[PDB]
From a paper:
One system that would benefit immensely from an improved mechanistic understanding of allostery is the archetypal protein tyrosine phosphatase, PTP1B (also known as PTPN1). By exploiting a new multitemperature multiconformer X-ray approach, we have identified a collective allosteric network that is contiguous on the ‘back side’ of the protein, centered around the quasi-ordered α7 helix.
For this reason, we designed and synthesized 2, which has the orientation of the amide bond reversed, allowing for one less carbon in the disulfide linker. 2 exhibited dose-dependent tethering and partial noncompetitive allosteric inhibition of K197C with a tethering EC50 of 7.8 ± 1.1 µM and a Ki for pNPP activity of 7.1 ± 1.1 µM (maximum inhibition of ~60%). To futher validate that 2 acts specifically through the K197 site and to explore the mechanism of inhibition by 2, we solved a high-resolution (1.95 Å) crystal structure of K197C tethered with 2. The structure confirms that 2 tethers to K197C rather than to the active-site catalytic Cys215, and also that tethered 2 resides in the 197 site rather than in the relatively nearby BB site, which is also theoretically within reach of the tethering linker on the other side of the α3 helix. We modeled 2 as partially populated and, indeed, the 83% refined occupancy in the crystal structure was very similar to the ~85% conjugation measured after tethering in solution prior to crystallization. Beyond these mutation-induced effects, we see some conformational changes associated with tethering of 2.
Numbering used by the authors: 1 to 285
The structure:
């Protein structure tokens, strides 16, 4: 497999930091003017992580339509994702408004609420069936329906109700709970099993809105999730799978949101996940 030996080549030569930096200098730069408006300073978790204006998701409350969220559109793979930051205490209502307005079926969470002794995002869904959440700014109600805790991740069924119309939708929440505080997982196995769980749920499918994917900044682990998903999808779609160049896919995704894949270590891990996930989809059972 092309990338498999390109992987060994990079590894043996300890070249990850050099490839990753070539990616950073090749990466697109587009304006992020809405994100920088003073009125939006507290809608951003990080000052240096902003959605591009061209791809940003707009809340349909036109009032302030801003949310730190980007639409990543992968045209050949026919996949779309919304990558967003972990919601802030003051943007949880916006997050669920986005989920509602974009008709998303799944939310993918790749971080824990607290990591490294700091809060990486707000507790934005209910932890008990009987204790639902009501977001009064956006007129939404969110109920925990069911929770399936597994060794490496948790899947939850949620009910999102639009209070103004009394329509309800079921949202699936896929929470990868075991990414390490430092570095990347030692093996990609649990991450792929997580990815295939999201796929199996139907959440990534074109009949629904884009899956909403987040970590804390919405670029690192979140970038790794989408990048692997799209590369594997392309390797199945193309006549020759070895024509799939992960670096090119990354650069295409970076046209939609800055900074995807934060460290050379995440890049290496992304390669590893795609190579291993290939074995599970280009054959086998
Ligand atoms: S790990 C793959 C997966 O789909 N897991 C999972 C799915 C669901 C669910 C609920 C409702 C529905 F209409 C479809 C569906 F797949 C619930 C829990 C769970 O772990």
């Amino acid at each position: 497999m092309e990338m498999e030996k390109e992987f060994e080549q990079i590894d043996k030569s300890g070249s990850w930091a050099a490839i990753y930096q070539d990616i950073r200098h090749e990466a697109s730069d587009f304006p992020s003017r809405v994100a920088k408006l003073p009125k939006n300073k507290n809608r951003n978790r990080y000052r240096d992580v902003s959605p591009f204006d061209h791809s940003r998701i707009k809340l349909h409350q036109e009032d302030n339509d801003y949310i730190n969220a980007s639409l990543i559109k992968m045209e050949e793979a026919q996949r779309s994702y919304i990558l967003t930051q972990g919601p802030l205490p003051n943007t949880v209502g916006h997050f669920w408004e986005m989920v509602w307005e974009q008709k998303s079926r799944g939310v993918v969470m790749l971080n824990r609420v607290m990591e490294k002794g700091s809060l990486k995002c707000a507790q934005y869904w209910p932890q008990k069936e009987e204790k639902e959440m009501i977001f009064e700014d956006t007129n939404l109600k969110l109920t925990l329906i069911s929770e399936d805790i597994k060794s490496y991740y948790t899947v939850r069924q949620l009910e999102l109700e639009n209070l103004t119309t009394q329509e309800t939708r079921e949202i699936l929440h896929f929470h990868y709970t075991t990414w390490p505080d430092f570095g990347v997982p030692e093996s990609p196995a649990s991450f792929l099993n997580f990815l295939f769980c999201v796929r199996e749920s139907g959440s990534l499918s074109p009949e629904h809105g884009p899956v909403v994917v987040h970590c804390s900044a919405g670029i690192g682990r979140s970038g790794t999730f989408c990048l692997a998903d799209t590369c594997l999808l392309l390797m199945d779609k193309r006549k020759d799978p070895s024509s799939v160049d992960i670096k090119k896919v990354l650069l295409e995704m970076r046209k939609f949101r800055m900074g995807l894949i934060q460290t050379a270590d995440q890049l290496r891990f992304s390669y590893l996940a795609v190579i291993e996930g290939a074995k599970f989809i280009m054959g086998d059972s």
